[PDB]
Amino acid sequence: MLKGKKAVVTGSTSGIGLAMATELAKAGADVVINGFGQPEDIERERSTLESKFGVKAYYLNADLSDAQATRDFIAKAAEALGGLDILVNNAGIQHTAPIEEFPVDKWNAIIALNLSAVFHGTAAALPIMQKQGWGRIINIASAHGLVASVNKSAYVAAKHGVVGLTKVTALENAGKGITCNAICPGWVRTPLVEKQIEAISQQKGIDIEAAARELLAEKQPSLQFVTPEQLGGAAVFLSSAAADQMTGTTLSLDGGWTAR
Amino acid sequence: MLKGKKAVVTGSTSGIGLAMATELAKAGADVVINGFGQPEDIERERSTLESKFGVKAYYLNADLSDAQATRDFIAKAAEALGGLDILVNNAGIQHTAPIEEFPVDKWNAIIALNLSAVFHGTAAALPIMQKQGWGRIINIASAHGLVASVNKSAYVAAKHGVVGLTKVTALENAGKGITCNAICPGWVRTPLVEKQIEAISQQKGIDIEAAARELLAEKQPSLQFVTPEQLGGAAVFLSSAAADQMTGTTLSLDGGWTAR
Amino acid sequence: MLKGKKAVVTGSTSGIGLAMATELAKAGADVVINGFGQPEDIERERSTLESKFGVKAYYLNADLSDAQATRDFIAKAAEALGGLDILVNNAGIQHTAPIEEFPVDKWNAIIALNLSAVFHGTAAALPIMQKQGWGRIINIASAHGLVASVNKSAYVAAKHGVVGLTKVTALENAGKGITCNAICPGWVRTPLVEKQIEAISQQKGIDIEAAARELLAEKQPSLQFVTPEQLGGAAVFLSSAAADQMTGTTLSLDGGWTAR
Amino acid sequence: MLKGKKAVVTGSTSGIGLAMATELAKAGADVVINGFGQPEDIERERSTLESKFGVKAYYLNADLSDAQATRDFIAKAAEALGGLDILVNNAGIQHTAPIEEFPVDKWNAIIALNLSAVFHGTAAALPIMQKQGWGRIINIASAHGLVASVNKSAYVAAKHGVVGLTKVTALENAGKGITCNAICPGWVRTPLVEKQIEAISQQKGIDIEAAARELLAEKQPSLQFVTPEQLGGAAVFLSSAAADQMTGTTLSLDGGWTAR
């Protein structure tokens, strides 16, 4: 239970971050959500957190590819919550192409969101956590923060960067009651992956479910997707006392991807 | 909750394994304990599991440096419990000396217990878990399964071996409902570490608590020991549904040791 | 011997890159050098490559923090050399501060040079190497591409990014006669390190050589600096036929830093 | 050039170790060879080292699964050579089966040769190298010292053990003029692999070369075997001055296996 705790989850209007925010609210935390989407869907998500789970929930729209907007979002989030105990740096994008054709603007956008926002969000949250002597920074990296695949230069670079940044954050805050860890999922069937399944299905001339099986078989020995609910469970574990001395590390939920 | 589950923890009469067994019994599992010690202390530990937590508990004495005794211990444990759902391969020893003075018998004893028993215990448990379609094998490795320190040749070799064996076990059982993971703790103040603190205190001419602080400062950036209760919490997490797609990996609770 | 080969070394007016360029010229390669410095020193370096080693050498000034300037520098370098066989992505900067005080402009400058220039230089070189069926991309990462230290958020993030980008480049070009690898040095006594030795000497009130010994002892078990000449030797090895199937990996010359 | 140096290569009557010994003799080292095979073939190999390359060569038969025989082999080798500067711990075996069917005797034989012989050979060589202030210990691990595959429990455990032991040896000898590193090859077409190609060919009903292509495609992105000559080149590099501060690390020649 995280009763009383104050959490922020970036990129929590879809996918993994939405499940993060739900699992943290179910554990008792007040939650700031963030991300793009239809305003009616975002407001139903926010109000649902409150009416199902009895916590306070706030939506703060901020495009976290901008540094100053990210730092201002953390300040606004802490003012909404009345503190900041758990920061989940989750928002991210993907684009696939080989390096020599990889658009310069897509490199810059993926480095901006998937790596630099993690730095700016951590920098703005740390003073709050240092003053109270307790905090959790949970970065959502990927198996692609530990290994690579073709056609993902920017995203692999950024996710490896997040794993390094996680280590530095942990070391600088060692023993202060603040931990920083990176959850490294394998494939999770969110819109970010469904586009890649559709691309495989067009390339091979197969139906979408046969394409999802091919996407899994190439990388993930369990042949099953990781779920957003399992990842929410991992974030709740990282937020627990059992994880007080887990810091600076990666928690791989990847179906065996990195074991081979 | 692990209500109904049947667990075996090797080397659970002291230290980390004792806390493993307690946390699994608190979660509702029946437990087989194992290890050396005074018979009166072992029987109080066994009866305490039952009277505090309402589960069934059995002590099976087996020296797991012997292959056949390890395989026969798993069979006896499964017969006691009426199944076998969670195996925690925890028993281990240490001996410190530089390689050219490292006793051949101590190399063989640490390879036998800290590595080969993990193989023989896994081999005997897997058919039970494969027939039921569910299992957890939780190997207790170390930060010394990922990095080294001087004067620990056998133990670093064995623990690196355990991390490799964990990966193979996970891959061979991928998708079968069986996961295998290695908990990699940093320093935990058990008798295995207290001997090394006493050696530092004699080498430096300092009191025991100043020696424990020196032992921590050299390796563990948090400057705090990992606790056996935290490790029990990690084993309960690995046994949970949130960890169904966590397989073949390491879970480092090490205070930042491996981040630098 | 690399007789006939055409090499580019970024950031080769000082430090490690200067020794890279010398060792590649000694092996017989024509060399493009690059970087900042006094024009008289840069021209003596360029002319020395030609008069000592009998190769052709060119200096191309380009600030590789700019994407388009980096891509245009590779085109100009290939036009100067009449091809491009070996690209050494070496230029880099450092700045130390804890995350919450780390200047936003210094984060952006270190990501721009130490990570994004490696992407833009690789993207511009690859088509040349793909058309000829042979190439070497040698990225200069760091032990801080594998582990972290305090107060180096940007640089650790960038160097971890370089190690990930190296893997992607290798995978996308697998079997095409092109390899990509990251040399990961420990401490090398160049101006980038001498500033950090001077900071230690001021913090501790000790002379500069006692400060260099402290800098080494904290991280580098050999207690000796890695030399630029040794790193040049490693780049010549990576450029050799023995390394035709070495691709996507790290070559650590770090005095044991990453072994513990 | 290694003119004057005195080298020992275990398991050098076939495969990679034979090429190790040839490349070290070509560089000028005197060489002790070892391993099983036909006596006429072994004596032609020994005499060929001398007549082609002008060095001294000795064959010492020792089954290195026995500890005392391994330590006595190093003493005999040093007496033959008049010293011992480079030790290449190469001898190894393979056996494939899933863990629950993996023969206990095959586990013990692979741990004995592939891991414990590396310990006993290092322990016996180190005092010689420590007295002279110079040495190279080159352990032949595998990509399976860093990642796993199914059906290779013992061998993955042993090779991970070798990578850990390499780190300890490097740390204990840091700064003493002695380095220890692990060459981690991907697939090399020796008899140890040809048996696995033949097994794939029988399983799939395909000719041997189609089976070798399948074996490569599953693991090795370059789709080309690593050669024994390339590995000999890597051992000569590790023995060179450029590698004086390369210690405690892995040198992966694996065609991209570990990059993904």
Ligand SMILES: NC(=O)c1ccc[n+]([C@@H]2O[C@H](COP(=O)([O-])OP(=O)(O)OC[C@H]3O[C@@H](n4cnc5c(N)ncnc54)[C@H](O)[C@@H]3O)[C@@H](O)[C@H]2O)c1
């Ligand atoms: N899906 C997977 O298989 C997978 C695997 C490993 C890691 N991840 C990581 O998980 C994280 C979440 O991804 P997902 O799969 O849930 O994707 P998703 O596309 O479902 O969700 C991305 C979320 O980020 C938000 N977002 C996008 N751009 C933003 C911006 N500029 N500012 C603020 N918010 C922004 C989106 O609105 C959305 O809420 C990402 O970091 C991704 O890299 C995903």
Ligand SMILES: NC(=O)c1ccc[n+]([C@@H]2O[C@H](COP(=O)([O-])OP(=O)(O)OC[C@H]3O[C@@H](n4cnc5c(N)ncnc54)[C@H](O)[C@@H]3O)[C@@H](O)[C@H]2O)c1
């Ligand atoms: N204490 C630490 O800092 C630390 C850190 C990382 C990993 N570990 C690992 O944690 C595990 C438990 O160690 P601990 O610190 O709790 O040590 P401990 O000495 O307190 O407990 C070891 C347990 O193993 C049992 N045991 C010893 N030899 C046995 C044998 N031949 N057969 C059966 N049981 C045997 C002992 O009786 C005892 O129950 C070991 O694998 C150790 O390597 C410990």
Ligand SMILES: NC(=O)c1ccc[n+]([C@@H]2O[C@H](COP(=O)([O-])OP(=O)(O)OC[C@H]3O[C@@H](n4cnc5c(N)ncnc54)[C@H](O)[C@@H]3O)[C@@H](O)[C@H]2O)c1
């Ligand atoms: N010195 C070490 O201990 C050490 C250790 C590991 C890795 N490295 C890496 O080695 C590489 C070289 O560093 P060094 O120690 O030789 O440092 P250095 O400062 O001596 O040399 C840096 C070189 O980069 C050039 N440079 C700087 N900014 C540039 C820009 N915007 N565009 C083009 N060139 C630019 C400089 O003019 C100089 O030629 C860097 O990537 C560094 O991260 C250094």
Ligand SMILES: NC(=O)c1ccc[n+]([C@@H]2O[C@H](COP(=O)([O-])OP(=O)(O)OC[C@H]3O[C@@H](n4cnc5c(N)ncnc54)[C@H](O)[C@@H]3O)[C@@H](O)[C@H]2O)c1
């Ligand atoms: N072939 C590969 O793809 C590959 C890949 C990675 C690592 N390796 C490692 O390379 C090393 C050499 O293997 P290889 O492929 O050349 O195999 P190989 O079978 O051709 O050669 C093995 C050598 O070891 C000797 N040997 C076997 N048992 C011995 C014993 N008990 N005592 C002394 N010598 C013994 C053999 O006689 C032979 O000289 C092994 O450690 C292997 O694990 C091989």
Ligand SMILES: [Cl-]
């Ligand atoms: Cl890939």
Ligand SMILES: [Cl-]
């Ligand atoms: Cl150490």
Ligand SMILES: [Cl-]
């Ligand atoms: Cl540090």
Ligand SMILES: [Cl-]
């Ligand atoms: Cl496999």
Ligand code: NA
């Ligand atoms: Na480390």
Ligand code: NA
């Ligand atoms: Na891998």
